[PDB]
Structures are given as C-alpha cells and as structure tokens.
Design a protein around this ligand. Sequence first.
Ligand SMILES: *[C@@H]1O[C@H](CO)[C@@H](O)[C@H](O)[C@H]1NC(C)=O
Ligand SMILES: *[C@@H]1O[C@H](CO)[C@@H](O)[C@H](O)[C@H]1NC(C)=O
Ligand SMILES: *[C@@H]1O[C@H](CO)[C@@H](O)[C@H](O)[C@H]1NC(C)=O
Ligand SMILES: *[C@@H]1O[C@H](CO)[C@@H](O)[C@H](O)[C@H]1NC(C)=O
Ligand SMILES: [Ca+2]
Ligand SMILES: [Ca+2]
Ligand SMILES: [Ca+2]
Ligand SMILES: [Ca+2]
Ligand SMILES: [Mn+2]
Ligand SMILES: [Mn+2]
Ligand SMILES: [Mn+2]
Ligand SMILES: [Mn+2]
Lengths: 231, 231, 231, 231
Amino acid sequence: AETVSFSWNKFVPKQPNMILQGDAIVTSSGKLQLNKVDENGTPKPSSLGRALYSTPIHIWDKETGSVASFAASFNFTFYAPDTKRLADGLAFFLAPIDTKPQTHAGYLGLFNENEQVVAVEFDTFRNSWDPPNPHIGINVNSIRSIKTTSWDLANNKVAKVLITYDASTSLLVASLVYPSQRTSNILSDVVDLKTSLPEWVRIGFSAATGLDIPGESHDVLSWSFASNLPH
Amino acid sequence: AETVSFSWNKFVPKQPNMILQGDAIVTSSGKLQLNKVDENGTPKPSSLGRALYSTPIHIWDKETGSVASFAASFNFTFYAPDTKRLADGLAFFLAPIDTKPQTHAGYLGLFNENEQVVAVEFDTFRNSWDPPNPHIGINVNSIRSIKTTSWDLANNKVAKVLITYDASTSLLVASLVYPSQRTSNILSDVVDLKTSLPEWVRIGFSAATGLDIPGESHDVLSWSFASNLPH
Amino acid sequence: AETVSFSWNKFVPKQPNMILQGDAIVTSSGKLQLNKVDENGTPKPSSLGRALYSTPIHIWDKETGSVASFAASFNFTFYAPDTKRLADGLAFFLAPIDTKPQTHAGYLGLFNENEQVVAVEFDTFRNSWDPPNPHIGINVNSIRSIKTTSWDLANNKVAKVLITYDASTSLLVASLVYPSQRTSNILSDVVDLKTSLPEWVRIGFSAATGLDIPGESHDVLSWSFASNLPH
Amino acid sequence: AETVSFSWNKFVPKQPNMILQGDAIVTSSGKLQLNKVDENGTPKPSSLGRALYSTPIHIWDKETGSVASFAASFNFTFYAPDTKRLADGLAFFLAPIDTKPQTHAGYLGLFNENEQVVAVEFDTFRNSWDPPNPHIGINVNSIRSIKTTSWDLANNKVAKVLITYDASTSLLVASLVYPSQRTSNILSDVVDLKTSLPEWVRIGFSAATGLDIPGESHDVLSWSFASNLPH
Ligand SMILES: *[C@@H]1O[C@H](CO)[C@@H](O)[C@H](O)[C@H]1NC(C)=O
Ligand SMILES: *[C@@H]1O[C@H](CO)[C@@H](O)[C@H](O)[C@H]1NC(C)=O
Ligand SMILES: *[C@@H]1O[C@H](CO)[C@@H](O)[C@H](O)[C@H]1NC(C)=O
Ligand SMILES: *[C@@H]1O[C@H](CO)[C@@H](O)[C@H](O)[C@H]1NC(C)=O
Ligand SMILES: [Ca+2]
Ligand SMILES: [Ca+2]
Ligand SMILES: [Ca+2]
Ligand SMILES: [Ca+2]
Ligand SMILES: [Mn+2]
Ligand SMILES: [Mn+2]
Ligand SMILES: [Mn+2]
Ligand SMILES: [Mn+2]
C-alpha cells in the first residue's frame, strides 16, 4: 500500500524536485512558464515546454495486478494577444521515466507525427483530428482524444483544474473551473492504465504555441497531487 | 484553525452519530433509505426523509470573519418504477442545528410553501419554478435554484457526487458522475455562507417522493466530508 | 472502513460540539478550564470537570470483530500555587455515551470508590494504589493503573501529549513532552478495547483538585483526534 | 506552503524512487537490507549501507526564513548472532543532495574520522564518545550526540520508531517502541535546521557492522514521511 503526495502553491526557481524541458522555466514571480514570450510577454511561435516531477510514480504493480488511483489539481492560465487566432494548447500527463519531448505545435509535445502516454488536453487549436472549438480531451497514446468536451476557456482568467482517476472503476475524470466567471466543465471516461503505461511513470505538463503564430502562452501556478497503490 | 472530517463506506443501523427524520432509515443491507417503499420495494407517494449528521459544523466565525471550506462526497441511487413519471428529488444540505423537516414533494422537505438553508438539488420533477428536465441546482434559502444544469440522470445506476466550497472564492461546485455510463455533470456558482447560514450548522440529506405518485426511491450509500475553518 | 477526525487550536466558548461537566468550562481566553479557581486564579479544592466530545466514536464493531486505531494529541497545563502540595491530577479517556462523572479528588472523576472506562492518567497525587512521584498511567477500568512511568512534570510550563492506539498490536502508547524544558516521557502497553468498552464510545478529559487542598488547576489548550475502523 | 509525503509498507526491489549506497540492497522478501550477511544470514564485518530517498526535501527557505516540520516513521530490525558482542549501529538522517557515504563502523557511515548532517542514532556500540549502553542519540553534524537515552533494544524483535520535528519549537523528538515487549523509549531536544543543513536535503538511513566483528545486521521494513514548509 504505497502512497505519495506533494503540493506547492508557488514554484521556486530551480527546485531540484522538478525537471524542466524545452522553453519551460520557472519565473522569479513564482509562475511556471512553459512557453517563451516577448520582452512584451508576447508568446513566441513554435515555443515548447514540459515539466516533470522528479520522483517517479508507481502507477501499478504487475506482481499484485494492483492499479493506483491518483488525483491531481493545479491552476493554470494562458495569455493570448489575439483571442481570434489561438493555439496550440496545454496538457497534463503521465509518461514513463525516460520521457523527453516530442512533436511541437499541435502535438502538444506529447505525440509524434509518426509513432506510452496518457493525458488530458486543453486544446486551443482545431487540428485535423480536433473537434470544433477549444475542448478538453483525454488522450490515450494518441493526440486523437478518446472523448472530449468543450472548454469554456477564457483569456487571461485563472482556471482551477481537477483530475481524478479511480482505479476501481478505471475512470479518469477531469473538471475545469473558472471561478472568475463562475463557469465549469467536466469530462469523464475509462482509461486502462494497466495497458497504456509502465508499472512506473513520471508526470508533468506540456504546452505549445503555434507554428505560424504565437497564439497563447501557458503558465502554471500551482500543483498538487496524490496517489495510493494498494496491496 | 478548526477542522473536521468523517467518512463511511456503508451505513450502520442505528449509528448514534446520525439523525434520522421522516421515513429515512438505515437498512441492514447498509443502504440509507430515505424513502418508504413497497414490500416490493416500490417507492410510496408522499414519502419523506432527512438525515443529519450528529456533530454540528462550525461553518464560519463572526469574531474572525473567517469562512470555511468544505467538501463532501457520497454515492446515491434512486429507484423508479416508471422512468416516465418521476419525482420528486433529492438534496444535500446545510441548515442550522434545530432543523426539522418541511414541505414534502416538490419542496424536497427543505423549503416551505410559505416562508436559512443552503443546498444542492437533484430535482427529478418539473415544478413551476423548475427548468426543463431533471437538473441539478444550487439552492440558497429557496427552492428556486440560483443556477442549474441538466442532470443526465439514470435509473437504478449509481452516481458519485462531489461538492466543494471554496471560501476564498466563495464558490460551491458540484459534479455528479455516473461511472456506469461514463457520463458526467458539473455546476458552479458563488454562495455567501456568511449571509445564508449560522456560524454553526448541521448537514445531511433530504429526499422526497411525489404526491400523486410514487416516482423514485432515494437511497444513499456512502458519505464523506471535511472542513477547515481558518484562524 | 469508518473514519473521523477533528482538531482545534483553541476552544470556542459554548461550542455545540462539546460537552462540559462539573466545573469544566471554556474561558473566553480560549483555554479549557476544567477546574474552578480563585478570582486570583487559585485552584479551588474539591473542584471537578470533564469535557466530552459530542460525536460518539465507533471504537469497534462486533459484527466484523474489527477494532480501531486512533490517536489523539493535545496540550495541557496546570497551575499550582504550592508545588510541594500537589493534586489531584488529569486524565484523557474513553467511556460510553452516557458517561456522567464519578468520584472526585483521587478518582479523577473517572472511577468510583466502589464499583467500562479506559484512560491515561497524569497523576499529581500519591494515593494508596499510586506509585511514588507524579507519574503517567494507563487505566483500564480502574484507578490502579496497569502500568506507569514517572512524569517529569513542570509547573506552569506547557506539555504536548500524544496518544496512540494500534489495534493491530493492541498497544496504547503515550508520550508527553515539555518543549519548554526539552524533557520527555513515554509509556506503553497493551489494552484490549474489545473487552473494556462499548462498540461506541465518547472521549474527553477529566480533572480534579484535591480535597483538603487546592493543588493544581488543569486547563487544556488544544485537541486533535482521529480514528480508522476498518472493514 | 510546500508539502510532501510518501509511505510504503514494504520495499520493492529496484524502486526508482530510492537510492542505494554501500551494501544496502532490497531483498525480494521486501526487506531493506543495509548490511551484507552470510549465506547463513550472518552479518559481515566492516559492512556498510545507506539508502536515500530520490526526491529532495525542501527543509527550509531562506527567502521566507521558514523552517519545516516533518515527521517520519519506520520499522527496523537487527539480527545479531552474539548479543554480547554488538555493533555498530543504525541511523536515520538528513543530509544534502550530493551525500555519498563516509566512515564506516562507529561512524555509522555518516561522519568522518576527520571533518552538514543531522541525525538520530541507534548506537549498538560504545565508542569513545559513546555513553554506556546502547542508546539513542541526536546527532548534529557530529557523531558525538547532543543528547542521548538508553535504548532498551532487543534482538530479532521489531521496533516501531517515530521522529518528529517541530519547527515552531525547533524540537526533534524520537520515540522508539517495541510492541513485542511492550517497552518504549523517547528522546527530545532542540535542533536548529536553519544552521545545520541546506535549504534542500535528502533523507535516508545508514547502517554499519563492526570492524573486528560482525555484530548485527540492520534491515528496515517500512518507511513513511511527511513535511510542511510554510509560507
Ligand atoms: C491558483 O493558485 C494561485 C497560485 O497558488 C493563486 O494565487 C490563485 O489565486 C489560485 N486561483 C484559484 C482559483 O484558486
Ligand atoms: C459507491 O459506494 C458504495 C458503497 O460504499 C459502493 O459499493 C459502490 O460501488 C460505490 N460506487 C462508486 C461509483 O464508487
Ligand atoms: C499548545 O497549543 C496552544 C494552543 O493551541 C499554543 O498556543 C501553545 O504554544 C502550544 N504548545 C506547543 C508546545 O505546541
Ligand atoms: C512493521 O512493518 C512491517 C512491514 O510493513 C510489518 O510486517 C510489521 O508487522 C510492522 N511492525 C509493527 C510493530 O507495526
Ligand atoms: Ca490541437
Ligand atoms: Ca422540483
Ligand atoms: Ca492519584
Ligand atoms: Ca558508536
Ligand atoms: Mn484534441
Ligand atoms: Mn430546481
Ligand atoms: Mn496512578
Ligand atoms: Mn552515540
């Protein structure tokens, strides 16, 4: 019966418990910038960042056949100079220890244009596989989400997000909420970890600006997470 | 900095920590029946039950001006012999210590046809003030909800529900989920406790069958809850 | 799998979640006075107070045979005008719902000079059954402790106390610590709840001044507690 | 306000969240062997192991001046073929990220015969600086403990240990308990982290067999730990 939890209400520059990738960095202001931006703070096209959590997570044990439940929360934001021309998006995810980045822009640095990753996307941009309108999605080893739901996204406003995975029912659930606007979104579906990730994994976020365009920055303010893996 | 939490995965007949009201009782089977039903288990019109939690909850302190945050979860179900003719509904709520029941049927035993109660309704029945289709609602000292959202309800299937109240932003958030169906609903809005309940309160559920008709039973399987009231 | 927890860092006058008995009251200053004292704050002989916690605790279930584990912490103090002439003591305890007080002075209001109570005593006074020097003791249905250990008590100084009961090993453990003095005491022994209390109980403290003399007041500053009762 | 916690009831061979050093390894049997032993399981003189926890711990922040509180628990054991001739001991500790081992035998791999380490020792062996009889000690940047207390140690029997550090009072407290024997030991003292470790640290255990002799193996069965570092 293994557990773990952590939580921060700010990010400390150069925390040794974290791992930055791509343009992803930790402002002194405490924010987690994953995207590169102008002196003017303008997001910079073809930008890319990821950020993982040092300790790896024992998602599930093969001996016991046990699968864990975890939940994670965090508040992110996005800045976008032209709310008409948006992209590319943000994700939270579970990968394996060795995970380096991947395709930028529409692949949210998670998938490859070509080719054991699970995640929740906050997609700003209508790709070919994307449905209409910024949505939220569950990605199971694929940028084409198993299920989606509009995301009543809102520029510059903060959003609290909560993600849960119930081993018992095998149900990832994600809800995003915008206190500023008193609006809210939720999504749910089954996901079989036992067959989509390694007995151990590392979690983190990923985020991408557009190619042709800047789109929107993506900074994360806080993160908490916990897991129980039963005997 | 006051806190409290409890949680049960079943109900024990005659738990001294609880309080039954109306037809509300605790089956040996461990369920929390709030409605009276046939030998055949058929809900029985004009039925009514409530069930409160012994210890009262210090929702907020006037000296300090502090307001608490709490969250509560629980899984309920409903049985309805004629999925066409449904009613009347279920609620979870915060009232003051002395709260006895009130109007039955459409008033979900919470309000009076006439006349400091806050709650979340899972309304099966279209009253006059009700919108169309079973919804979910936030009730603030009134059976006419401040905001609502369809409830993709489903007979006989179990639903996990989670309710949160963030003092900081003053935002009650409710999400109901039906793992069986992989569907999900969420609702959010601000609620000022400081002006809608007493420094201390008691929480519990309430549930009602129809007048003219039976409608649907309402049993609750589990309950967990916690609160922090800061210094 | 039933749980419960609460914690306060101060006492609120007239908390509806608590129960006072005897002279036990809640100063505005936030302290929990269990003993009556002078305008000068001088403890008043033959004084007596208890204070219980509203919600009852399901210590153990007969159907399942399950026994719970709990731990409790709290910081108390004692004021004693004549550190030479001390008494009578303080206790923390588990009794059954209906528990009213009992013998004063040396019986710490827990036992009767004559005659299902479990507790930990912080004895200031050498009774006949008492060993030498203020000690700490485990009382199992009897003022004559099953085991004891000196208590390097210290007037007017605050003491943090922690009590644990491990169902698995059936071991109550108590440790008292005096940060002020960087000193510390610990005691341990087995206790069979299953045969010394009711499936349900209520917990609280009890405290007594001397007969012939005042001895020492006993106020409690904070209290936290938790319990898991497994399936 | 940063926190973290983890806990395991067994050790998984080759957990990527841990770090072995010296002879320290993880038996398949789930135990954490820190010492090398015979095919017969006989401890092997001049043996040495340490084991650290992957994620580093932000013990305290210089900007804020904040210091954290943590507590840790774990159950260890020791096997010793000749209960007359014992050594060398075991420790739990906080060091800085880069910590590799150090002096063996009496230095419990923590200190150097010569020369920012804080720890609690379970010393089997009377060095020169050691007091009489296996004790427990608080080591602050030195194998000569700031304070000690006998350890009513017991061969082959399991011991539950609990360590707490209260930032507020700056008091490390350690209590060791032997349910098997219903005995118990406790130690307490102030320790200024702010001046004895780095803003960030890594924790783990260390353990040593004797030089001339085998003494006693040292395996650890379980570990839990948590920390809050306030804003
Ligand atoms: C999200 O977290 C940030 C940083 O911890 C905080 O300043 C902000 O107000 C938070 N927003 C919500 C909605 O909790
Ligand atoms: C809800 O709780 C009940 C009783 O604790 C349990 O048997 C049922 O499977 C639960 N359903 C979900 C979706 O967790
Ligand atoms: C004990 O609790 C009181 C009241 O909460 C506090 O003011 C006091 O400083 C505490 N002492 C210790 C040693 O924690
Ligand atoms: C200590 O932990 C081990 C492994 O988790 C367990 O098997 C053993 O019985 C425990 N002993 C105590 C006293 O809790
Ligand atoms: Ca896209
Ligand atoms: Ca209605
Ligand atoms: Ca006595
Ligand atoms: Ca030594
Ligand atoms: Mn998509
Ligand atoms: Mn309604
Ligand atoms: Mn005694
Ligand atoms: Mn020593």
